[PDB]
């Protein structure tokens, strides 16, 4: 479970890229997985069947290796029956995004320097990870908690915190990078002291 870290150790090669596949079937989920591991040497992070019956693949490697594994993976997935629901290929994922991939991490406390909070939910996992990556890159926000299609039937949400202007810039970039996959966004400009830090409980 130490393969989800941002930087590798000194005796390991560097793998900054990321690729997320989301498939309506589980059988060709495994076919897409080992085809992508046949073509290019991508370290596969997970091959996990998540709720609403869909298989979620996450792979990690260098930029060319992840790109080549993803082009093999999408020439296998779209074979007659279009069972590729959504895809994502980040050439460089943000450092605060890596440890929210394996398990659903929830947040229990904030700091006193937390003005505002934004909660984003998308219909897919790929749109959630894409919008979280874009919003972490463009603005000094902190990703607090994130759920990816387990227990909530395919939907995926995440919350960011920070200054109100920063989380509204993140709201703009999330609404641009999702477009039609964003279900509904909420911009809490000042959360209640009975709810700061402890939202889902």
């Amino acid at each position: 479970p130490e393969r989800f870290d941002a930087t590798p150790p000194a005796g390991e090669p560097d793998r900054p890229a990321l690729g997320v596949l989301e498939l309506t079937s589980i059988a060709r989920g495994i076919t897409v997985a080992d085809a992508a591991l046949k073509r290019a040497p991508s370290l596969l992070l997970m091959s996990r069947p998540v709720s609403s019956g869909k298989h979620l693949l996450m792979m990690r490697g260098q930029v060319a290796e992840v790109e080549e594994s993803m082009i093999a993976a999408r020439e296998i997935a779209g074979a007659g029956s279009g069972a590729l629901l959504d895809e994502l290929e980040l050439p460089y994922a943000h450092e605060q995004l890596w440890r929210f991939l394996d398990a659903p991490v929830v947040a229990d406390a904030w700091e006193e320097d937390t003005e505002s909070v934004i909660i984003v939910e998308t219909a897919t996992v790929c749109a959630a990870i894409d919008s979280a990556d874009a919003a972490l890159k463009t603005a000094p926000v902190v990703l607090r908690d994130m759920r990816l299609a387990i227990g909530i039937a395919g939907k995926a949400f995440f919350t960011l915190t920070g200054e109100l202007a920063d989380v509204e810039a993140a709201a703009e970039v999330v609404r641009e990078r999702c477009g039609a996959r964003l279900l509904e966004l909420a911009c809490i400009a000042r959360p209640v002291d009975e709810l700061r830090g402890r939202l889902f409980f």
């Binding site: 463009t138 603005a139 202007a165 920063d166 509204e168 810039a169």
Partner: protein, 92 residues
């Protein structure tokens, strides 16, 4: 550090009007100006993204009345390799 905002004007006069309207619009800081030659100058303000986002849209409105505006853009958070390589005002 803070967010970035820019008005590029082909002409010094439109840039001075834009740089006045930006610092009168919202709480920004005119760090200076960049002369890229050929008559193009670029006024650079810094501040949090709501203030520079109001300041640049006031400076574009006040600078098109006096000259030629080339480009208006706001970066909410410049990367640490941009402030440390480009003369934008937060070079350590």
């Amino acid at each position: 550090a803070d967010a970035l905002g820019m008005i590029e004007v082909r002409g010094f006069v439109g840039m001075v009007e834009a740089a006045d309207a930006m610092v009168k619009a919202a709480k920004v800081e005119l760090i200076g100006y960049e002369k890229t030659g050929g008559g193009y100058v670029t006024a650079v303000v810094r501040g949090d993204v709501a203030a520079v986002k109001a300041a640049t849209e006031a400076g574009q409105r006040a600078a098109e009345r006096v000259g030629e505006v080339v480009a208006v853009h706001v970066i909410p958070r410049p990367h640490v390799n941009v402030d440390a390589a480009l003369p934008l005002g937060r070079t350590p």
